[PDB]
Design an enzyme around this catalytic site. Structure first.
Site, mmCIF file in Angstrom:
data_model
loop_
_atom_site.group_PDB
_atom_site.id
_atom_site.type_symbol
_atom_site.label_atom_id
_atom_site.label_comp_id
_atom_site.label_asym_id
_atom_site.label_seq_id
_atom_site.Cartn_x
_atom_site.Cartn_y
_atom_site.Cartn_z
ATOM 1 N N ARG A 1 15.414 8.207 -0.250
ATOM 2 C CA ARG A 1 14.125 8.735 0.173
ATOM 3 C C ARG A 1 13.351 7.867 1.161
ATOM 4 O O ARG A 1 13.220 6.658 0.972
ATOM 5 C CB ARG A 1 13.266 8.974 -1.072
ATOM 6 C CG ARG A 1 12.016 9.805 -0.848
ATOM 7 C CD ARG A 1 11.263 9.969 -2.163
ATOM 8 N NE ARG A 1 12.136 10.480 -3.217
ATOM 9 C CZ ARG A 1 11.824 10.501 -4.509
ATOM 10 N NH1 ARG A 1 10.649 10.035 -4.917
ATOM 11 N NH2 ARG A 1 12.694 10.977 -5.396
ATOM 12 N N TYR B 1 9.626 -3.510 1.900
ATOM 13 C CA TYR B 1 9.544 -4.201 0.617
ATOM 14 C C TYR B 1 10.562 -5.339 0.540
ATOM 15 O O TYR B 1 11.253 -5.505 -0.466
ATOM 16 C CB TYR B 1 9.781 -3.219 -0.535
ATOM 17 C CG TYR B 1 8.829 -2.041 -0.545
ATOM 18 C CD1 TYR B 1 9.074 -0.914 0.238
ATOM 19 C CD2 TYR B 1 7.666 -2.068 -1.316
ATOM 20 C CE1 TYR B 1 8.183 0.159 0.255
ATOM 21 C CE2 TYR B 1 6.767 -1.003 -1.304
ATOM 22 C CZ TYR B 1 7.030 0.105 -0.518
ATOM 23 O OH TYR B 1 6.136 1.153 -0.490
ATOM 24 N N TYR C 1 2.000 -6.603 -0.534
ATOM 25 C CA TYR C 1 1.092 -5.811 0.287
ATOM 26 C C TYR C 1 0.200 -6.713 1.113
ATOM 27 O O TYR C 1 0.225 -7.936 0.962
ATOM 28 C CB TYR C 1 0.212 -4.903 -0.580
ATOM 29 C CG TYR C 1 0.994 -3.824 -1.273
ATOM 30 C CD1 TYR C 1 1.631 -4.072 -2.487
ATOM 31 C CD2 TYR C 1 1.162 -2.574 -0.679
ATOM 32 C CE1 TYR C 1 2.421 -3.105 -3.092
ATOM 33 C CE2 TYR C 1 1.954 -1.598 -1.273
ATOM 34 C CZ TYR C 1 2.580 -1.871 -2.477
ATOM 35 O OH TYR C 1 3.382 -0.924 -3.059
ATOM 36 N N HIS D 1 14.099 4.063 -2.039
ATOM 37 C CA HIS D 1 13.716 3.584 -0.715
ATOM 38 C C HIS D 1 14.648 2.450 -0.310
ATOM 39 O O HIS D 1 15.184 1.745 -1.164
ATOM 40 C CB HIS D 1 12.280 3.051 -0.710
ATOM 41 C CG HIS D 1 11.242 4.079 -1.033
ATOM 42 N ND1 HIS D 1 11.193 5.310 -0.413
ATOM 43 C CD2 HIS D 1 10.187 4.043 -1.881
ATOM 44 C CE1 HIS D 1 10.154 5.988 -0.866
ATOM 45 N NE2 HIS D 1 9.527 5.241 -1.758
HETATM 46 C C1 LIG Z 1 4.363 2.161 -7.786
HETATM 47 C C2 LIG Z 1 4.600 3.249 -6.762
HETATM 48 O O1 LIG Z 1 4.688 4.435 -7.096
HETATM 49 N N1 LIG Z 1 4.711 2.876 -5.471
HETATM 50 C C3 LIG Z 1 4.936 3.681 -4.325
HETATM 51 C C4 LIG Z 1 5.809 3.073 -3.232
HETATM 52 O O2 LIG Z 1 7.089 2.830 -3.855
HETATM 53 C C5 LIG Z 1 6.011 4.018 -1.987
HETATM 54 F F1 LIG Z 1 6.757 5.100 -2.371
HETATM 55 C C6 LIG Z 1 4.736 4.807 -1.565
HETATM 56 O O3 LIG Z 1 4.201 3.654 -0.748
HETATM 57 P P1 LIG Z 1 3.177 2.356 -0.655
HETATM 58 O O4 LIG Z 1 3.482 1.239 -1.586
HETATM 59 O O5 LIG Z 1 1.863 2.736 -0.969
HETATM 60 O O6 LIG Z 1 2.952 1.563 0.685
HETATM 61 C C7 LIG Z 1 2.658 2.425 1.804
HETATM 62 C C8 LIG Z 1 3.645 2.312 2.883
HETATM 63 O O7 LIG Z 1 3.659 0.942 3.331
HETATM 64 C C9 LIG Z 1 5.018 0.541 3.636
HETATM 65 N N2 LIG Z 1 5.354 -0.802 2.925
HETATM 66 C C10 LIG Z 1 4.495 -1.386 1.898
HETATM 67 C C11 LIG Z 1 4.759 -2.592 1.241
HETATM 68 C C12 LIG Z 1 6.040 -3.295 1.668
HETATM 69 N N3 LIG Z 1 6.374 -4.423 1.116
HETATM 70 N N4 LIG Z 1 6.885 -2.750 2.656
HETATM 71 C C13 LIG Z 1 6.582 -1.481 3.327
HETATM 72 O O8 LIG Z 1 7.383 -1.019 4.224
HETATM 73 C C14 LIG Z 1 5.895 1.751 3.351
HETATM 74 O O9 LIG Z 1 6.158 2.369 4.627
HETATM 75 C C15 LIG Z 1 5.087 2.627 2.436
HETATM 76 O O10 LIG Z 1 5.329 4.018 2.668
HETATM 77 C C16 LIG Z 1 4.805 5.678 -0.402
HETATM 78 O O11 LIG Z 1 4.045 6.597 -0.372
HETATM 79 O O12 LIG Z 1 5.724 5.469 0.572
HETATM 80 O O13 LIG Z 1 3.637 4.803 -2.507
HETATM 81 C C17 LIG Z 1 3.547 3.951 -3.682
HETATM 82 C C18 LIG Z 1 2.465 4.731 -4.453
HETATM 83 O O14 LIG Z 1 3.079 5.986 -4.901
HETATM 84 C C19 LIG Z 1 1.138 5.033 -3.837
HETATM 85 O O15 LIG Z 1 0.511 3.878 -3.259
HETATM 86 C C20 LIG Z 1 0.061 5.577 -4.792
HETATM 87 O O16 LIG Z 1 -1.051 6.029 -4.077
#
Ligand SMILES: CC(=O)N[C@@H]1[C@@H](O)[C@@H](F)[C@@](OP(=O)(O)OC[C@H]2O[C@@H](n3ccc(N)nc3=O)[C@H](O)[C@@H]2O)(C(=O)O)O[C@H]1[C@H](O)[C@H](O)CO
Ligand SMILES: CC(=O)N[C@@H]1[C@@H](O)[C@@H](F)[C@@](OP(=O)(O)OC[C@H]2O[C@@H](n3ccc(N)nc3=O)[C@H](O)[C@@H]2O)(C(=O)O)O[C@H]1[C@H](O)[C@H](O)CO
Ligand SMILES: CC(=O)N[C@@H]1[C@@H](O)[C@@H](F)[C@@](OP(=O)(O)OC[C@H]2O[C@@H](n3ccc(N)nc3=O)[C@H](O)[C@@H]2O)(C(=O)O)O[C@H]1[C@H](O)[C@H](O)CO
Ligand SMILES: CC(=O)N[C@@H]1[C@@H](O)[C@@H](F)[C@@](OP(=O)(O)OC[C@H]2O[C@@H](n3ccc(N)nc3=O)[C@H](O)[C@@H]2O)(C(=O)O)O[C@H]1[C@H](O)[C@H](O)CO
Lengths: 243, 258, 237, 238
Positions: free
Chosen positions: B129, B156, B162, B188
């Site tokens: 995904r 990640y 973050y 992912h």
């Molecule tokens: C616990 C949980 O469910 N984590 C998921 C996470 O696995 C990922 F699925 C997603 O993403 P999310 O962490 O918020 O972070 C947003 C975007 O930032 C990038 N990023 C972030 C940190 C990192 N180290 N490397 C990265 O590349 C990715 O492109 C990601 O899509 C998502 O929608 O893609 O959302 C969270 C939550 O569902 C959401 O925040 C709740 O509101």
């Protein structure tokens, strides 16, 4: 428009008289067509048709066939009828969202009002069901094809050994008259032309033989090919379980 | 069509080389973007994206961010896919009646047939995904954007890191997976997102750029052309740094959609 | 567009400064409007609005009002919002087949995206609801009206039978304020002795005249349909 | 279209004054019309109407009537109203997929907004129902017919008796017909001067017309019953 060869997977598929092969045509294949031991009609399909019951696995398999460069197809059709006793309702409802690049065959089949009515009446009230070979003819006519060449339709064996492990794990009316009557109805009603490419098939007793054009066709061999349907993961079936 | 900066919330969001920052551009933010301690990309958003799972609460929180003048946004997107295992069916069905000023991201995502087919095949059959960072790229393309500047996307690498402290009380209550050492979703992958991004750029003839030279993303996407520009990051004080949780009565009214 | 007078059924309805009553106007009435002892705004209505909860009975009642020459109306509106917790789902779904000459007010209410969002957010998350007066204003704006004159807004055994226990000032006021600030329309107050006058500009005095016709032998209570009728509509209540 | 003869199956069907038959007309028949012992209105129907309750069996029977060339029809109509207490909901929802060459009568009936409202109000609140004769008139008007000739309307077989061992009345039907005529500016005529209908509708003009009443021999005079397998497939719609 262009001509179309519609192939079922009966034994006649291996008995096509290629001297009668038309010039410039599209190819429609169905279900376990890839089980064929040689490329009796080439690797290029205009469309491939799969029944709703195994669409999930056939789609999965098709993607592998394409990646492996074993076949290519422009269209992916699901042979549905919008009948609760014939296919899963939610499957049809959500079809385009699970398979964005495929089509519900009923979208075209229903364009032939007279035949849809013909099919439904006999299936509902008399339990007579047409085979995929005939369903493909209807969809071809709906798509605009005017000259339809039939092969692999033997009214029941296959042009290959269909006794495969994966397929057996998945799937351990009809009659010749129903199919023949349905084909005649289609030809008469929509003023199209049907031809038989298999002179030794029982079908040759009902449909005119495709004219001899002294044509030639190279039947390419197949080696180490995909000859069984593939089974998706347990996680995959879980996500698709509702359909 | 102005240029667009699509930002994930990875640690690279705090390391943007503002010398490469484009001129006239729109900004796409997602999920807990407001957790940032500085306006790394300004207060004005063209669109904000929220996942179906927390859309109810994120919408509520957004209205507070707007009322409190912390951010502003033109569009409010729900990152859906029309997949029963990913979202509530009723929620999607009645969406426009419960959130009249928002949009279902799928209304746009599905306009890219090839990518939708690509996404669905890998997700359904291989549990591969794309992340919302990539989802936003697809929606931007569908909206007409042809020059996409990426940031905050780190795959990640260092785990669930973050550009801020995401371990906030309410978020942890609503999405308990955030309490785990590594909350990253197994489906992912660095490859999945990269390949998905490559697929989009190619198939739809758009240009991708990277605003984070030090990011792992800089090893795949061409760095944004140093326009030798300045930005000025505004500081944030006593800002909203956690998601808000609606009243019990509100949840009761929305129960059929969750 | 013709001007429109939107009337609630508050006491101010009986205290309209007719000197300010416009010339060519349409009238919007709601719920138990027919309980009025005089035709404060005439017998002719452009539209009548009824809440989903009593629509079944109000529709039945309206047909009698019309056949009995008490009132006439071009449109019949049901004040719905497309919210499961506010209206019966099947009722909305099958509405046009049970009442072919009526309309779901939401079909128009939803044309005002910003107000729909404003209403939904406050109702869902804060349990703040608007009254029919405000709902009708929204529908008027959605229908293309430019000038709206408000009246009757001050914040029977059968009715008591159907509604046994038979909103806020701030909510309605704030909603009206949002409506005027957001859309291209003008709001006026026809009742200078109503609290509404403290928030909405008074309708300009036009030195107008208007004969208030009395009412006699009129329907002053809601009618209750037969048990057989209820049996047929039970799924929608 | 143009001119249409709408026929119920009452006694007046056998007492039509053929001298008054229009020259160019279409014919609308309903339910057990085939029970007629003679072709009082010919074998060619423009449309046949069946109530939702027995449509499954009537459709099956019509296909036999057609196959055996006893009758022919261009349109096949189901007299529905989109009312749960009057018809099965799934039946209406999937109708076109089970009967591709048929039509839901409501698709046309609803085009007469005033009449649809008129009918619904009186059926829902006063339990007043209209007969097929009236339903067909509405559909005819919705289809574009301007001159309607009525017959077989008089206000009053093992298979039929086993399948089907109200709120109708002359008043309701007559008032409904008058409403239709007045509201849609069309003309109604009565082809049966010996029927009570004559007391309300103007007799069709005598044009000294001629009509051959064809005989019927060894004809279908009872509804046919589908196989249990057929029923099992349509069970959810009954
Ligand atoms: C616990 C949980 O469910 N984590 C998921 C996470 O696995 C990922 F699925 C997603 O993403 P999310 O962490 O918020 O972070 C947003 C975007 O930032 C990038 N990023 C972030 C940190 C990192 N180290 N490397 C990265 O590349 C990715 O492109 C990601 O899509 C998502 O929608 O893609 O959302 C969270 C939550 O569902 C959401 O925040 C709740 O509101
Ligand atoms: C076990 C089971 O369910 N068998 C059925 C079979 O009875 C037939 F219904 C159908 O097709 P299937 O025949 O196999 O293969 C395609 C077509 O080839 C023609 N043929 C084949 C062999 C033969 N001797 N004479 C013939 O005429 C028919 O036109 C048929 O439609 C169908 O879709 O019509 O599909 C299979 C499977 O559901 C399917 O293969 C799994 O993906
Ligand atoms: C018990 C119950 O449920 N009461 C509510 C009431 O709180 C109000 F919600 C509403 O209003 P309703 O009384 O009929 O009166 C119509 C309109 O007149 C205005 N008004 C009336 C009296 C007053 N003193 N000050 C005012 O301002 C309001 O703007 C209201 O919208 C409504 O639809 O807005 O309807 C009633 C009933 O649900 C309905 O009458 C049954 O058919
Ligand atoms: C028991 C039951 O439900 N009876 C009703 C009946 O009250 C009437 F509603 C209706 O009537 P239907 O027979 O088809 O016949 C059509 C019309 O012919 C006239 N006529 C008939 C026989 C007679 N002896 N005197 C007459 O005057 C009437 O004007 C009637 O409306 C209808 O839809 O109009 O249908 C039947 C059945 O539901 C149906 O036949 C079964 O498929």
């Amino acid at each position: 428009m262009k001509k179309v060869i519609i192939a079922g997977n009966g034994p006649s598929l291996k008995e096509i008289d290629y001297s009668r092969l038309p010039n410039d045509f599209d190819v429609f294949r169905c279900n376990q067509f890839y089980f064929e031991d040689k490329y009796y009609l080439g690797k290029k399909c205009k469309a491939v048709f799969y029944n709703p019951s195994l669409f999930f696995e056939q789609y999965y398999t098709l993607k592998h066939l394409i990646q492996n460069q074993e076949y290519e197809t422009e269209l992916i059709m699901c042979s549905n009828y919008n009948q609760a006793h014939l296919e899963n309702e939610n499957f049809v409802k959500t079809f385009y969202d699970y398979f964005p690049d495929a089509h519900l065959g009923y979208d075209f089949f229903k364009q032939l009002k007279d035949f849809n009515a013909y099919f439904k009446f006999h299936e509902i009230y008399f339990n007579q069901r047409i085979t995929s070979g005939v369903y493909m003819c209807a969809v071809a006519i709906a798509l605009g094809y005017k000259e339809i060449y039939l092969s692999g339709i033997d009214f029941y064996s296959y042009a290959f050994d269909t006794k495969q492990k994966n397929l057996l794990k998945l799937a351990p009316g009809h009659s010749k008259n129903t199919d023949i009557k349905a084909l005649e109805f289609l030809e008469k009603t929509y003023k199209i032309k049907l031809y038989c490419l298999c002179p030794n098939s029982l079908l040759a007793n009902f449909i005119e033989l495709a004219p001899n054009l002294n044509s030639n066709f190279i039947i390419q061999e197949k080696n180490n090919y995909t000859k069984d349907i593939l089974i998706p993961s347990s996680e995959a079936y879980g996500k698709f379980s509702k359909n």
